[PDB]
Amino acid sequence: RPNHTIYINNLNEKIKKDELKKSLHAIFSRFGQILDILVSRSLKMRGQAFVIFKEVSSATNALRSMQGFPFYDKPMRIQYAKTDSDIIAKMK
Amino acid sequence: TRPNHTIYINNLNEKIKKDELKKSLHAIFSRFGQILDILVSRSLKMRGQAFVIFKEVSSATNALRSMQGFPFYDKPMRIQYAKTDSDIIAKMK
RNA sequence: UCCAGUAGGAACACUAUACUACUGGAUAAUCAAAGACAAAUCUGCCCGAAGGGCUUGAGAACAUACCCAUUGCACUCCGGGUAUGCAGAGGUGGCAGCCUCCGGUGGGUUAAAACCCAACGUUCUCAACAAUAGUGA
RNA sequence: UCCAGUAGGAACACUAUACUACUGGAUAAUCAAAGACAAAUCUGCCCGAAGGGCUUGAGAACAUACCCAUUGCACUCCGGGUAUGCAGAGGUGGCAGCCUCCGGUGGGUUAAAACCCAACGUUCUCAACAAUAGUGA
Ligand SMILES: [Mg+2]
Ligand SMILES: [Mg+2]
Ligand SMILES: [Mg+2]
Ligand SMILES: [Mg+2]
Ligand SMILES: [Mg+2]
Ligand SMILES: [Mg+2]
Ligand SMILES: [Mg+2]
Ligand SMILES: [Mg+2]
Ligand SMILES: [Mg+2]
Ligand SMILES: [Mg+2]
Ligand SMILES: [Mg+2]
Ligand SMILES: [Mg+2]
Ligand SMILES: [Mg+2]
Ligand SMILES: [Mg+2]
Ligand SMILES: [Mg+2]
Ligand SMILES: [Mg+2]
Ligand SMILES: [Mg+2]
Ligand SMILES: [Mg+2]
Ligand SMILES: [Mg+2]
Ligand SMILES: [Mg+2]
Ligand SMILES: [Mg+2]
Ligand SMILES: [Mg+2]
Ligand SMILES: [Mg+2]
Ligand SMILES: [Mg+2]
Ligand SMILES: [Mg+2]
Ligand SMILES: [Mg+2]
Ligand SMILES: [Mg+2]
Ligand SMILES: [Mg+2]
Ligand SMILES: [Mg+2]
Ligand SMILES: [Mg+2]
Ligand SMILES: [Mg+2]
Ligand SMILES: [Mg+2]
Ligand SMILES: [Mg+2]
Ligand SMILES: [Mg+2]
């Protein structure tokens, strides 16, 4: 079921953390407010990213019209996060 | 570059069999109009590429526009207009 | 191995020497390029018995490049591997800030420059070395 | 090396030798598994002087899988490597349909099946070989 935070993978792992951050925010901002967007290049967290919207509908609208988007020459795979983010759990 | 019945596509997943590529392409482009034929070769020079021929010029335009970048077989499509008319069309009108 | 130019020459300051680096040269060692400790000595909080490193090395981290793995649901940084790092500087120790210089970017301005604006720049731990001569207080 | 079972034994057809392959066995050579040329002798067009290959090997092409190349404007076809291919068959030459049989795959049906439907299946060139005997027509 829907969730403020969307989970993205299949991301071009060769992209620097900094760039990936701003690039993601750039293409998702048009969908609403973005509290934060977590990105790690660990062995376990690379090629992945968590985007946090302030509204649940924003995430839904983003998951739908952006699914498959050719991000850095790779089709995005957006899903809902299986659990709420800390920023949101400790907010409401 | 001006419109053309036939659209040129490249950056296609070269690992895909000729047969599959054929039907898969027709499957996603049919919604844009009639398709006379769709040429696909796996030569050294023609692989990763495909030519789709519509019966209407507008069909090709509508297809080039709303399909550009489409994640086909895990690869962004690169649709352009064919630089020259196809034989099927030249020998038709 | 020598010679010169330039920078440095490491716990106060200058000079000379040893010596290190860069550049070019062959006893006459060319001519030259090149280059940041210039100015000034800041505010706040904190620690110490005492605040001042243009040395080298060994670890560690970090950054950048490729290579091998990895399709991975997290919210504390954190797989492995080769190569690279030798530009940042002054303001007396640490953190924060502010000022100035240097640098290569990105803007603004110009005919073009200046001039301005902004962000950014390898750090920690350990170990060795920080010499000699002269002068200065 | 022998023995058996099975298939084959290559230019009409049986059969028996030689011989090839698969499977299992040791002179008594086990028991067994396994397996498609069964039915039928089709419709066009074209070629010939005469239409009938379950043989072997090599090469080439092609498919599949992997590896390096390649972002590439075509409309007969096509870069390299590397490993597999030993199942397709009958309907008298070539081509095109069609029919049936094998095979696996996909789909429908059924409680399961049987059985239906569908698309599929290694080709070409060269070289060698297509033997004895018997009975046939
Ligand atoms: Mg982050
Ligand atoms: Mg000097
Ligand atoms: Mg020294
Ligand atoms: Mg030299
Ligand atoms: Mg000085
Ligand atoms: Mg000074
Ligand atoms: Mg100093
Ligand atoms: Mg210093
Ligand atoms: Mg070091
Ligand atoms: Mg998954
Ligand atoms: Mg998990
Ligand atoms: Mg690493
Ligand atoms: Mg190193
Ligand atoms: Mg540096
Ligand atoms: Mg200091
Ligand atoms: Mg101070
Ligand atoms: Mg400071
Ligand atoms: Mg500057
Ligand atoms: Mg102007
Ligand atoms: Mg700075
Ligand atoms: Mg000294
Ligand atoms: Mg026999
Ligand atoms: Mg034989
Ligand atoms: Mg044997
Ligand atoms: Mg028969
Ligand atoms: Mg015969
Ligand atoms: Mg086969
Ligand atoms: Mg025949
Ligand atoms: Mg015939
Ligand atoms: Mg035939
Ligand atoms: Mg069948
Ligand atoms: Mg039938
Ligand atoms: Mg068949
Ligand atoms: Mg014979």
Q: How would you class A50 by CB atoms within 10 Å of its CB: exposed for 0-12, middle for 13-18, buried for 19 or more? A: middle
Contact assessment for residue B48 and residue A42, using Cβ atoms and an 8 Å cutoff = no
Dihedrals φ, ψ of A29, to 5°? -55, -35
The beta strands (E) that lie in chain A are given as 5-9, 34-38, 49-53, 77-80
* Cα B91 from Cα A41, distance rounded (Å): 57
- Assess whether A19 (CB) lies less than 7 A from strand C: no
CA of A68 to the centre of ligand 15 (A): 54
- The dihedral of CA B8, B10, B13, B17: what is its sign? positive
Grouping H, G, I as helix, E, B as strand and the rest as coil, residue A7 is: strand
Helices (H), ranges, A29-84 = 56-66
Expressed in Å, this structure's resolution amounts to 3.0
**Which structural domain, as residue segments, surrounds residue B43?**
1-93
Rounded to whole angstroms, the distance from the CA of residue B12 to the C1' of nucleotide C43 is: 63
Domain count within chain B? 1
Buried b (16+ CB within 10 A) or exposed e, A11-20: beeebeeeeb
Measured in angstroms, the CA of A12 and the nearest CA of chain B are apart by 13
Pairing of strands B6-10, A34-38: unpaired
Rounded to whole angstroms, the distance from the CA of residue A22 to the C1' of nucleotide D37 is: 73
The experimental method behind these coordinates is: X-ray
Measured in angstroms, the CA of A3 and the nearest CA of chain B are apart by 25
CA of B24 to the centre of ligand 31 (A): 28
Rounded to whole angstroms, the distance from the CA of residue A36 to the C1' of nucleotide C98 is: 31
C-alpha to C-alpha distances, B17 to A37, B57, B66, B68, B73, nearest whole angstrom: 39, 28, 25, 22, 12
Tokens of B26: 């027709």
* Cα A91 from Cα A88, distance rounded (Å): 5
CA of A90 to the centre of ligand 15 (A): 43
Q: Are B71 and A73 an interchain contact pair (Cβ–Cβ within 8 Å)?
A: no
Contact assessment for residue A66 and residue A27, using Cβ atoms and an 8 Å cutoff = yes
* Cα B80 from Cα B9, distance rounded (Å): 6
Sheet order of strands, A5-9 included:
A34-38, A49-53, A5-9, A77-80
- Return the half-sphere exposure (C-beta side, CA atoms, 13 A cut-off) of residue B27: 8
Tokens of A29: 């901002």
* Domain of residue A28, CATH code: 3.30.70.330
Dihedrals φ, ψ of A78, to 5°? -90, 135
